[PDB]
Design a protein around this ligand. Structure first.
Ligand SMILES: CN(C)S(=O)(=O)c1ccc2c(c1)/C(=C/c1cc3c([nH]1)CCCC3)C(=O)N2
Ligand SMILES: [Ca+2]
Ligand SMILES: [Ca+2]
Ligand SMILES: [Ca+2]
Ligand SMILES: [Ca+2]
Lengths: 145, 304
């Protein structure tokens, strides 16, 4: 509502990555699949608590309004910095400070996406301001701010 | 003689002064049904009828008419060698199934109409169309229906009509025969209408235990298509029945016309397409931001 149309579209895209069967809700199992696909290791109790914290109407799954309102949370600026940094480290598998096309491809494969190598290169170029072919920390931050 | 040409086997059935036995042509091994008539028991009048019947059957060669292949006269016995059929009477198949689907009824009546049209083209009026006189050539779901029992058939000259006698089967009799009027080829088309009606719902259009009342109903054309059984039957089927069960024989549909009715012969959409100018552009930045946002969310549990 106070988000732009493009901001809403970006969150719909994120939502589609969680909602694997495309039924318009995210289950606990769906949440766990994404988390583990991104190298995160929550317990089953932790996953259910995450669902419970976001599930306003208490029907056991997260719909898009619930998913939105969650990240319509204007949390601390220090918390957003932390999220961006830890996210960077997820993409940068070898820890060299640069996200390569190969590394991005691996993340998208892990997430279940089927993209061509050209689409992945195009994605790198959207963030790769200095044009070296990789996304460094500063570029990654610029993109998300 | 007969026994030099045909090997006879078991009895298949009986008739008036007659038995039908399976038989086999000796040199070829092909099987038939031999109708064996004991002519020592026939009056001259009955032999004259047999003579007419055999003459008429010899004349008719058609896939929907039981074929007479041979007529052999011996002392006291006359042999008529017909197609063997193993599917029984259409009558019994109707009883077994209750009634036919419209697809199956149309296909059945189409063959019956071809048999009747062939008769009529050859100057023959059968006069006794009914399911009891129509035989299924084999037990196949696709078996041909074959017209049989030409014992009442008559030879007519073109479309000339006359009083040919009160003959036929009560429920199938035409109004013109019941009125004792001159008649002709159209009596078979009236009977066809009675059969189609029976095919579709499993009971006849005219029936009464008192035959006088039956005859009154027929002459009046007192039939209808009652609910609920007729409710799902298409109006095209009812229309064809109407045209067959027409009391005035000059206005009744002929076999050839009935074969062109849409319910019989017409049983078996383009839209503009828009130009595609291009494909939708992949949105690289939204794809990447969605993935990054997903990962940011995923890392909260590890941080918190
Ligand atoms: C039409 N009349 C019943 S008939 O006697 O002139 C006649 C004419 C042609 C026929 C048969 C009977 C006939 C009779 C028949 C009876 C049965 C069979 N065919 C197959 C085995 C079970 C019972 C047959 O195969 N071809
Ligand atoms: Ca789902
Ligand atoms: Ca919910
Ligand atoms: Ca790297
Ligand atoms: Ca770069």
């Amino acid at each position: 509502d106070q988000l732009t149309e493009e901001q809403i579209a970006e969150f719909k895209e994120a939502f589609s990555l969680f909602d694997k069967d495309g039924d318009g809700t995210i289950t606990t199992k769906e949440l766990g699949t994404v988390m583990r696909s991104l190298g995160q290791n929550p317990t089953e109790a932790e996953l259910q608590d995450m669902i419970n914290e976001v599930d306003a109407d208490g029907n056991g799954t997260i719909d898009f309004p619930e998913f939105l309102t969650m990240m319509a949370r204007k949390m601390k600026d220090t918390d957003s910095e932390e999220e961006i940094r830890e996210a960077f480290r997820v993409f940068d598998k070898d820890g060299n400070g640069y996200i390569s096309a190969a590394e991005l491809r691996h993340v998208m494969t892990n997430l279940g996406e089927k993209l061509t190598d050209e689409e992945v290169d195009e994605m790198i170029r959207e963030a790769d301001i200095d044009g070296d072919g990789q996304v460094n920390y500063e570029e990654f931050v610029q993109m998300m701010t | 003689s007969m026994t030099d040409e045909y090997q006879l086997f078991e009895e298949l059935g009986k008739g008036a002064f007659s038995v039908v036995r399976r038989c086999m042509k000796i040199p070829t091994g092909q099987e038939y049904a031999a109708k064996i008539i004991n002519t020592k028991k026939l009056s001259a009048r009955d032999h004259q009828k047999l003579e007419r019947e055999a003459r008429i059957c010899r004349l008719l060669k058609h896939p929907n008419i039981v074929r007479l292949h041979d007529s052999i006269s011996e002392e006291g016995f006359h042999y008529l060698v017909f197609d063997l059929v193993t599917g029984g009477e259409l009558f019994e198949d109707i009883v077994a199934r209750e009634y036919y689907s419209e697809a199956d009824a149309s296909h059945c009546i189409q063959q019956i109409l071809e048999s009747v049209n062939h008769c009529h083209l050859n100057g023959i009026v059968h006069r006794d169309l009914k399911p009891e006189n129509l035989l299924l050539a084999s037990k196949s779901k696709g078996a041909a229906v074959k017209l049989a029992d030409f014992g009442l058939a008559i030879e007519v000259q073109g479309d000339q009509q006359a009083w040919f006698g009160f003959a036929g089967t009560p429920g199938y009799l035409s109004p013109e025969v019941l009125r004792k009027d001159p008649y002709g080829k159209p009596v078979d088309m009236w009977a066809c209408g009675v059969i189609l009606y029976i095919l579709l719902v499993g009971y006849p259009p005219f029936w009464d235990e008192d035959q006088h009342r039956l005859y009154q109903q027929i002459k009046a054309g007192a039939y209808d298509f009652p609910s609920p059984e007729w409710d799902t039957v298409t109006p095209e089927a009812k229309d064809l029945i109407n045209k067959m069960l027409t009391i005035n024989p000059a206005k009744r549909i002929t076999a050839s016309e009935a074969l062109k009715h849409p319910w019989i012969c017409q049983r078996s959409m383009m839209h503009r397409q828009e130009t595609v100018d291009c494909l939708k552009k992949f949105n690289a930045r939204r794809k990447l931001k969605g993935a990054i946002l997903t990962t940011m969310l995923a890392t909260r549990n590890f941080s918190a």
